[PDB]
Structure formats: structure tokens, C-alpha cells
């Protein structure tokens, strides 16, 4: 399923769309940023995501919108962080370890 | 050795139920705190803390068998 | 008939003791039945100890001990002679010399 995310500011209402995460619910406060909390449903950069946590809709290039682990039951395990060179090695649902 | 007349030596050695008459090892007592004039009364093999109410100190704490008495307490058995 | 009162192993008030592997045969023997000989000897053998005195950098060097628990199954323990052939009344001995 898909998660319709409604964002309200002072200026406008943004209507965002994400693939639904197991544990999403209608009325959930989600946070989409760089270093938001690492609760289920939030979206943040992988450097601020701790290792061993299954993430989904992972971007392949930065600000791509999310490419990998997008169909049912899929998740991507964050294996490690190369904090120099700014590289995260992740485990894909096919078992492929991807930088 | 007579079975109907067991000597007082052997009775305290044997089990309380296995005596000729089942005899208690427990009793009651009086606890005397020094800062305190009243004498709180308690069981020998107590399962509850006993504290003197005014000038509050803990008198005896429960243990496996006989409750161990805490601090400076004069004790007096109660039998009559 | 029943040859040993303990039936060969030291198991009493257990149901199961985990198996260990024989150090000579790699057989699966329980830890209770297994013949265990703890040998503590020097690393350098006693014949060569005069030759290590001439060669140590250190004044008063203590040669280290070698620690190993030989654990033998029953078949190889009589074959390695870790257990000695005894009589029927000699079977009930338990003390080491």
C-alpha cells in the first residue's frame, strides 16, 4: 500500500506520497528530514540511521526519491558506515551488499 | 534407655515433631529500645520488620529462622 | 550382569551429560564416562633445561608449564594405558598414586 502524507506549514499544504511502512497508521506524525528521530515511518539520511535497522524506500543516488526495497515485505539492512568517504554499505532484499 | 521417659538431653537434639510431645522452638519476646521507653513485643521467628514507633529505629529483621535483632536491643522471653 | 556399581560413568542425579570428543579417537564419549588425565609439565623438556640456561637473555628465567587436559574414550584409554589393568576387587580402587 501507499501512504498519503499531508504536510501543513504556514504557507501551503504539501501532499507527499510514500510507500506504506508496516506500522504506519492514519494520523501518524511522520518526520521527513536529515536527522529526524529513527522511529518507524520517518525518513532521514542513512548517516543518521544506526546500523542494523531495516529501512525501506532507500535512495540509490542522493535526493532520488527512494528506489530500493519498495515492494511488499522488503527492507534494507544498514550494515555499516564509512564515516570517512561518507559511504553506507547496505544489505538489499536479494542479499546483495550494496554501497 | 527408656522410650516412655526421654531425657531432657535427647529431646532438644531430636526434631520438634519427633519428640514425645511436639514442642515449640519459638516464643514471643519484648524488645527494648534505648531512646524509647515502651517495649514493643514480637515473635521469635518473625516474618515482619519491627520498629519502635517514636524515635524510629529498626529492632529486628526477619531471616530464615529466628529473626535477627538489629542494634542495641535488650530482649526478654515471655514464657509463663 | 552389572559390572560396575556406577555403570562406568560418574552420572548420578542427572539425565544427560553432554558428549565430548576423544583426544585420540575423536569418539563421542560423555564427559562423565570419559577418562580425563590433566597433565601439567614444563614446556621445555627436562633434558634440554641445561641448554636453555646457557641461552636465556634473562637471569633466573622460569621455564613455563604446559597445561593440557587429555580426555580419552574408554577404548583408547586402555590402549594408551591411561587406565591400568586391575583385578575385579582391584576395580573398586578410586585413589590416584
Amino acid at each position: 500500500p501507499l501512504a498519503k502524507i499531508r504536510v501543513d506549514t504556514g504557507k501551503c499544504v504539501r501532499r507527499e506520497l510514500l510507500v506504506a511502512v508496516e506500522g504506519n497508521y492514519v494520523g501518524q506524525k511522520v518526520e521527513i528530514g536529515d536527522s529526524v528521530p529513527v522511529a518507524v515511518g520517518n525518513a532521514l539520511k542513512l548517516k543518521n540511521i544506526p546500523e542494523g535497522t531495516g529501512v525501506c524506500s532507500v535512495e540509490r543516488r542522493p535526493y532520488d526519491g527512494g528506489k530500493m526495497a519498495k515492494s511488499s515485505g522488503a527492507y534494507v539492512t544498514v550494515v555499516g558506515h564509512n564515516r570517512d568517504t561518507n559511504i553506507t554499505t547496505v544489505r538489499l532484499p536479494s542479499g546483495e551488499k550494496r554501497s | 534407655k527408656d522410650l516412655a521417659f526421654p531425657t531432657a538431653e535427647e529431646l532438644r537434639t531430636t526434631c520438634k515433631r519427633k519428640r514425645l510431645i511436639p514442642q515449640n522452638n519459638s516464643y514471643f519476646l519484648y524488645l527494648r529500645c534505648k531512646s524509647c521507653d515502651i517495649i514493643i513485643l514480637a515473635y521469635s521467628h518473625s516474618q515482619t520488620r519491627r520498629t519502635c514507633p517514636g524515635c524510629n529505629m529498626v529492632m529486628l529483621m526477619p531471616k530464615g529462622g529466628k529473626a535477627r535483632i538489629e542494634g542495641d536491643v535488650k530482649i526478654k522471653k515471655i514464657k509463663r | 550382569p552389572v559390572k560396575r556399581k556406577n555403570h562406568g560413568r560418574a552420572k548420578k542425579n542427572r539425565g544427560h551429560v553432554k558428549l565430548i570428543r576423544c583426544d585420540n579417537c575423536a569418539s563421542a564419549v560423555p564427559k562423565d564416562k570419559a577418562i580425563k588425565r590433566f597433565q601439567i609439565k614444563s614446556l621445555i623438556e627436562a633434558a634440554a633445561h641445561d641448554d636453555v640456561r646457557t641461552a636465556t637473555i634473562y637471569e633466573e628465567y622460569e621455564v613455563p608449564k604446559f597445561f593440557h587436559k587429555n580426555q580419552y574414550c574408554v577404548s583408547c584409554a586402555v590402549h594408551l594405558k591411561a587406565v591400568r589393568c586391575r583385578s575385579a576387587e582391584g576395580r573398586k580402587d578410586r585413589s590416584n598414586p
Binding site: 500500500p1 501512504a3 506504506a20 511502512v21 508496516e22 506500522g23 504506519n24 497508521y25 492514519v26 518507524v40 535497522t53 531495516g54 511488499s72 515485505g73 527492507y75 | - | -
Partner: protein, 81 residues
């Protein structure tokens, strides 16, 4: 008046599809059709609406969950952290 001794909910499939396939889908058809307790209102009124979406019919609390259960093992583990 049980009706069936062993098949239960997969008695609708009759004799078709093989015993092991009917035995396999029985645990899932029990799972996908059952009412579950809403964790927002307390009532056993959560029913599946479509694959992946589970809604409580009492307090309209709808949530994204598993295909034929409200919770999967991978989904439970990410939420228990």
C-alpha cells in the same frame, strides 16, 4: 453440527487443489479473515480491507500492516526497537 472434522475453513475448496495446498492456505485464510484487537480502541474489530491495510471497523483506526496478518515478524521487529 461441526460439518467438517479436519479442514474447517478450507472446506469451501472441496476436494480440489491438493491436500497440502489446502493445508497450507488454511492458516492464512484463518489469519486474513479474523478480527483482531484494535490497539487504539481496544475492541476486537480490526479487519483487513485490502492486502496490506488493516482497519478497525469500530473507531475507524486504519493502519498499514502485513498481507494476511496485521503484523509480520519483520514488521514487529522494526517496531519493537
Amino acid at each position: 453440527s461441526r460439518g467438517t472434522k479436519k479442514v474447517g475453513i478450507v472446506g469451501k475448496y472441496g476436494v480440489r487443489y491438493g491436500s497440502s495446498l489446502r493445508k497450507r492456505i488454511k492458516a492464512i485464510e484463518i489469519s486474513q479473515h479474523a478480527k483482531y484487537e484494535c490497539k487504539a480502541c481496544g475492541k476486537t474489530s480490526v479487519k483487513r480491507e485490502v492486502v496490506g491495510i488493516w482497519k478497525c471497523k469500530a473507531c475507524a483506526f486504519t493502519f498499514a500492516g502485513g498481507a494476511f496478518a496485521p503484523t509480520t515478524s519483520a514488521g514487529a521487529h522494526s517496531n519493537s526497537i
